Design a protein around this ligand. Sequence first.
Ligand SMILES: *c1c(C)c(C)cc2c1nc1c(=O)[nH]c(=O)nc-1n2C[C@H](O)[C@H](O)[C@H](O)COP(=O)(O)OP(=O)(O)OC[C@H]1O[C@@H](n2cnc3c(N)ncnc32)[C@H](O)[C@@H]1O
Ligand SMILES: CC(=O)N[C@@H]1[C@@H](O)[C@H](O)[C@@H](CO)O[C@H]1O
Ligand SMILES: [Cl-]
Ligand code: NA
Ligand code: NA
Length: 502
Amino acid sequence: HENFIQCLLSHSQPSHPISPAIFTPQNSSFSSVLQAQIRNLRFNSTSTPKPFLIITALHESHIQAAIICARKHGLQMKIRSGGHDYEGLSYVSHVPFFVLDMFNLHSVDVDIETETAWVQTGATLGEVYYRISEKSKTHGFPAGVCPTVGVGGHIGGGGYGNMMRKYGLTVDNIVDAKLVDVSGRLLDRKSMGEDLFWAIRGGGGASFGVVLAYRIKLVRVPETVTVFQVRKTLEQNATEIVYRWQQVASKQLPDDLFVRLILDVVNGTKSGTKTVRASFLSLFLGDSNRLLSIMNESFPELGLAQSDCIETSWIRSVLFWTNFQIDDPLNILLNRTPPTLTFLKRKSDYVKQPIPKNGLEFIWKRMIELETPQMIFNPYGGKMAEIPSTATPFPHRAGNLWKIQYVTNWNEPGTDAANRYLNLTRKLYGYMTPFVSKNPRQAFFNYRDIDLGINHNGKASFEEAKAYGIKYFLGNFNRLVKIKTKVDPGNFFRNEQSIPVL
Ligand SMILES: *c1c(C)c(C)cc2c1nc1c(=O)[nH]c(=O)nc-1n2C[C@H](O)[C@H](O)[C@H](O)COP(=O)(O)OP(=O)(O)OC[C@H]1O[C@@H](n2cnc3c(N)ncnc32)[C@H](O)[C@@H]1O
Ligand SMILES: CC(=O)N[C@@H]1[C@@H](O)[C@H](O)[C@@H](CO)O[C@H]1O
Ligand SMILES: [Cl-]
Ligand code: NA
Ligand code: NA
């Protein structure tokens, strides 16, 4: 790989030297640089394939170099921003590969006048939120809950958060972007064209190029927002409460109200026994009095009271939504490292019809017998129902009541232990089949699941890619494929779930 390392130095601009950005295993730095952006401990095992090199891009020129050199030397590049990829596809590969690490490109330039912000893809959601909140307590951006998530993957993959019912996705709130293409041209919306600007807003940036920055459209948040978390076990009538949630959370609750439902298995009231806990976690873009009127009318079964409501800034709602204390200092959002790392599996599903009470009691018995899997239900409807399926590569719009995330975490290392938790996760997904979308079984790209299929990027690539691509992108998969064939016909930008060429 020394002709590649030489091509990189060969392409170095003298204003921004590439050498301090190149790490090979002979640098004693290498291990911690690889490890710094790892967010799934499954992909930090000794047996996990390591890149032979990491470029920690310090300038647009380092990206241009890495693309041009990797391309003429036929090398697999993995782009990494926040490293949250649930499958580690940003830092893991079964062919020899290097990682282009974007974390040093984390500029956030907030313009409250135009309600916009130029955000480098190496920035985290927490840095973006922190930087908005420093200029204005009445602006925000409808992205994800996890402060350490990277902008690159989050927006690339169609990121959502607790204001999607009001403002839609992250990708519904982009005015411009900067991207380096297969040719090493630095492009913006204008030079990139509407096809590529569409593709990188939910179609997985890493199939099309290195996104350097999104220009994001900020949104108005109220001077006061309301949050709550209310927990109900099966013994507190959780079945009736969940059942009612299903009928209102996407369909009836005003667009200002997001009520997430987290389902997990906890110790019951009788010793040794387990029960299902239904946690209702909410952001209301408004005050407790309007919320309490909504909930008394549309969802009284939750028993939401004034004592459940916390009123705070939009920025402190973010803290609350990531289990940080509501009085924590805001700069905790600048920590790029989560307080806990675990072994984890994620899958997703979409629900299009409410689960009958019989079906919920079914799920409670299955969840109690598998103990560890949890499910998170994220209501869609409001703006998510108003945007056409074609507006972004992300297709899941009207007709979807909610998105399920299957959440299985564990601490025990080793494949044997992994296989057990993966198996539990696959079983709950299996049980959920009749309740969730079918023909095809919809999936959310950002909840990446290699169980949906692996693109080996040879002869079979288009065939293999259909297996996850139709699930992620439904009928938009064909447009992604057309655009991929035009912007990257040689499939330089590839990964285990990349958009294939025709
Ligand atoms: C909470 C937590 C704790 C995690 C780890 C993930 C979360 C999350 N909460 C989320 C939420 O509330 N809403 C969401 O929509 N998603 C949430 N996620 C998932 C998260 O959005 C995805 O995992 C996302 O992909 C993370 O992005 P990242 O941190 O940038 O992750 P990677 O560096 O692993 O990259 C992911 C993926 O995108 C490609 N990529 C990264 N950077 C790129 C640039 N600059 N250009 C092009 N492509 C880029 C990577 O190659 C990889 O394929
Ligand atoms: C983030 C993390 O847990 N990384 C571990 C590191 O702590 C451990 O010491 C190292 C062996 O030296 O192996 C890594 O996977
Ligand atoms: Cl997560
Ligand atoms: Na290593
Ligand atoms: Na109402």
